[PDB]
Design a protein around this nucleic acid. Structure first.
Ligand SMILES: [K+]
Ligand SMILES: [K+]
Ligand SMILES: [K+]
Ligand SMILES: [Mg+2]
Ligand SMILES: [Mg+2]
Ligand SMILES: [Mg+2]
Ligand SMILES: [Mg+2]
Ligand SMILES: [Mg+2]
Length: 44
RNA sequence: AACAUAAUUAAUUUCUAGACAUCCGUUUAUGAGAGGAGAUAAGUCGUAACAAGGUAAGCAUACUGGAAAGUGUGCUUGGAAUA
């Protein structure tokens, strides 16, 4: 078990960084659609 | 009235809401009362037509009359025409 903890903890740090990047993408995509929504109302 | 969410399998939602009510008219039935035509069928009043029907007849039209009918004007023969 001691050896597995080191391996699992290393993967855990990688997952945290992967999750952080994916979360930022969702936040950015949300901002763009909301900005477009304003333009759509301006056209409407 | 027609947008908005969502999106590291992908989908959700919108994609509406009133007013289609009277009609203006148009047909038919009802018929106060007033007429017509026809038939019923013994009658009444005249004798208008058919004979040159006893005023030759008729047409259009006008007027007149119990009723057929009478009179005028033009027209027709589906009348006559030698004294
Ligand atoms: K006569
Ligand atoms: K007569
Ligand atoms: K005659
Ligand atoms: Mg006569
Ligand atoms: Mg006579
Ligand atoms: Mg006459
Ligand atoms: Mg007279
Ligand atoms: Mg006279």
């Amino acid at each position: 078990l001691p050896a597995c903890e080191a391996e699992d903890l290393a993967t855990y740090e990688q997952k945290l960084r992967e999750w952080h990047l994916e979360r930022v993408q969702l936040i950015q995509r949300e901002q763009e659609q909301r900005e477009k929504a304003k333009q759509e109302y301006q056209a409407l």
